Design a protein around this nucleic acid. Structure first.
Ligand SMILES: [Zn+2]
Lengths: 48, 218, 61, 275
RNA sequence: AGUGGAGCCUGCGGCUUAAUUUGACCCGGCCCGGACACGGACAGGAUUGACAGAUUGAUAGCUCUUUCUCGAUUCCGUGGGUGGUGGUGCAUGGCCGUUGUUGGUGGAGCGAUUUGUCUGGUUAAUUCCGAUAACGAAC
């Protein structure tokens, strides 16, 4: 904190500083099988 | 740091030789500039007359060097004139300053009419000659100033001459000849014999013979 | 130096696509996602056949 | 010739030994993440595998990320990863990603190519889509490092000038800049934050005045960037300077003058209305 | 022994070509392209992200159905005596480590210039032996 200060005429906001300096499964298997399906689907070699 | 080589320099480095005039009395060569730095010092002003760049013919072609004409002079006393050609302008200027300092001659100053006060003008009309350039100095009254061309104007003001009428003949446009001619005239100021200098000379012992015992130790 | 003329050559770039604006879409909410983090708050969007998530993209039938 | 040589004599001795001897005789997710690791090493465009897009939803995301080898990624892949991590909240996680992956790449290639790539420029803009993780993650760490150069300063500050910043976040960044020890690149960021011309919290103004007044007794010669930062401060915020601070700034100008910029600052300070 | 003659290959000119990149090129197509000021819209959402299916030469959530979430991190026009992740020229400074050519001094000439840097022998050589108004040096 410094010495000389705002003197007069109002404060609109107080400002929040104590958050800056004071700072310092099934779904994955489904995504896996979707990935394997798409990786097999770039060339299928079977469909007629 | 100055370490003298000549005997005259070794005497000047000590307090054996008191004035420059003693060295002028026995007509001895001054072969170190540090003697002139010792005796005159801060009195010595130096004025660059001219720098001309020149082209030396080399086996590689032509390459540039510089030629500096420098007049050095203690006012109310002494001057010298030096010319040096060298590779850069700064080294040419300091070389010409040294080579002008090694040529310092005294000038005799006299009176125009009545002998009241200090001498101000040349004692008698003198003449200096260099390669078709002829420069004549004529005594002038007090307050008349140096009436001359700018290059001898500088050299005569540096000599401590206050006032002089001048006359120049020949190719005065070549500057080294013109400067050397006016330097010759102001040397012939003391080479001239007047009735003031008619008493028989007494011969005082030379510094080489006066201080032989001091030069034994070196 | 020598200055250039700065040719004009107007080419209209005003026709650029913007996605459609749906106004006051909070009418139609009142399926809930039973997820690990986005439960009880997020509404679970409907196709013609199947409802898809808008935060975690889970797969159903 | 008097000596045989190495190789021929080696063959001769082996031959003689042989002749003497013969006369004497008579889990599974690891493979997926490794595969998409080779994919991201050569990515140019197009859609990413869905295994890459569910990384911020994972619990052990860091181990997956070291498997994906972010230091070997390409610029388009890093831009899309920045977009993915900015899309899925968790400001601490985004801050740690910017600390670990993004800013090391930017510091590495600005020092190498002397200019920033297009994709990484849009990557810092997309990282600025979440500003709190940016300020605590890249800007304040870059300023706290002390090794930030001028070109990094100009690039990142230009990214700051392009975007509209929240006033509270901008003010906190300005205060953390102001209390920090001086570096030559620091005044560039401070100036580009003052160019935003937001309403300024007064404690930040006091810190700025104290910082510039802490430059009062310094014998170090200052660059023109410091003078221009001070000129911006005076030009935009002369209305809320106290007379004590005003005279202190004039004293600072008297002690640390510039032939060109200092009279202009004196003109702006002498023509200022308060409140 | 060849090459230069012959078939093939390669380079450089030349010729064709949309391009035949150069002492990266061609044909199409999507995307967006600054701050600041002014005028609009935004909390009666600004905008991001988005699974499926249809598209055009492309698995374009950078478009349509699905508009679901994301809570300002704003985007739409009007703007230039405006420009900055620009280009270029000038000026000056930071990081390791040390304390055959021509000068200097002397001799010659007003000077440009000269002598040094040379009769003879010798060497690749102002090298060397040595003669000498020159003597001593650095690269
Ligand atoms: Zn979804």
């Amino acid at each position: 904190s410094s010495v000389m200060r705002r003197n007069e005429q109002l404060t609109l906001h107080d400002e929040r500083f104590e958050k800056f300096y004071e700072q310092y499964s099934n779904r994955l298997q489904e995504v896996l099988n979707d990935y394997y399906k798409e990786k097999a689907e770039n060339c299928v070699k079977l469909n007629t | 740091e100055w370490m003298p080589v000549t005997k005259l320099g070794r005497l000047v480095k000590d307090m054996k030789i008191k004035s420059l005039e003693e060295i002028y009395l026995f007509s001895l060569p001054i072969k170190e500039s540090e003697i002139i730095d010792f005796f005159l010092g801060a009195s010595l002003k130096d004025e660059v007359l001219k720098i001309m760049p020149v082209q030396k013919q080399t086996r590689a072609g032509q390459r540039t060097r510089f030629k500096a004409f420098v007049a050095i002079g203690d006012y109310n006393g002494h001057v010298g004139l030096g010319v040096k050609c060298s590779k850069e302008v700064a080294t040419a200027i300091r070389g010409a300053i040294i080579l002008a300092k090694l040529s310092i001659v005294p000038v005799r100053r006299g009176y125009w009419g009545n002998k009241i006060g200090k001498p101000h003008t040349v004692p008698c009309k003198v003449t200096g000659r260099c390669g078709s350039v002829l420069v004549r100095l004529i005594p002038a009254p007090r307050g008349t100033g140096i009436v001359s061309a700018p290059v001898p104007k500088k050299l005569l003001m540096m000599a401590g001459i206050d006032d002089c009428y001048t006359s120049a003949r020949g190719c005065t446009a070549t500057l080294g000849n013109f400067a050397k001619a006016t330097f010759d005239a102001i040397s012939k100021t003391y080479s001239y014999l007047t009735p003031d200098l008619w008493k028989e000379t007494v011969f005082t012992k030379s510094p080489y013979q006066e201080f032989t015992d001091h030069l034994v130790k070196t | 130096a020598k200055k250039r003329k700065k040719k004009s050559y107007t080419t209209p770039k005003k026709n650029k696509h913007k996605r459609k604006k749906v106004k006051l879409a909070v009418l139609k909410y009142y399926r809930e996602c039973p997820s690990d983090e986005c439960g009880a708050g997020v509404f679970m969007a409907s196709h013609f056949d199947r409802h898809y998530c808008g935060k975690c993209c889970l797969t159903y039938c | 010739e008097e000596y045989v040589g190495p190789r021929l004599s080696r063959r001769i001795l082996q031959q003689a030994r042989q002749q003497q001897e013969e006369l004497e005789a008579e889990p599974r997710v690891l493979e997926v993440y490794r595969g998409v690791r080779e994919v991201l090493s050569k990515y140019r465009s197009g859609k990413l595998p869905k295994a890459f897009k569910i990384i911020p939803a994972l619990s052990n995301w860091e181990q997956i990320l070291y498997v994906t080898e972010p230091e070997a990624w390409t610029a388009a892949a890093m831009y899309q990863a920045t977009r993915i991590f900015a899309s899925n909240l968790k400001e601490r996680m985004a801050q740690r990603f910017y600390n670990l992956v993004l800013l090391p790449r930017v510091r590495d290639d600005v020092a190498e190519y002397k200019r920033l790539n297009f994709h990484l420029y849009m990557a810092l803009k997309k990282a600025l889509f979440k500003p709190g993780a940016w300020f605590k993650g890249i800007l304040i760490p870059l300023c706290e490092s002390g090794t930030c150069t001028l070109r990094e300063a100009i690039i990142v500050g230009s990214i700051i000038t392009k975007c509209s910043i929240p006033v509270l976040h901008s003010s906190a960044a300005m205060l953390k800049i102001a209390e920090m020890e001086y570096s030559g690149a620091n005044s560039i960021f401070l100036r580009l934050l003052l160019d935003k011309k937001y309403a300024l919290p007064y404690r930040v103004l006091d810190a700025l005045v104290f910082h510039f007044l802490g430059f009062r007794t310094e014998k170090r010669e200052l660059p023109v960037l410091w003078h221009q930062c001070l000129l911006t401060l005076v030009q935009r915020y002369k209305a809320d300077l106290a007379t004590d601070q005003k005279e202190a700034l004039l004293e600072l100008l008297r002690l640390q003058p510039h032939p060109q910029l200092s009279p202009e600052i004196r003109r702006e300070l002498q023509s200022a209305v308060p409140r």
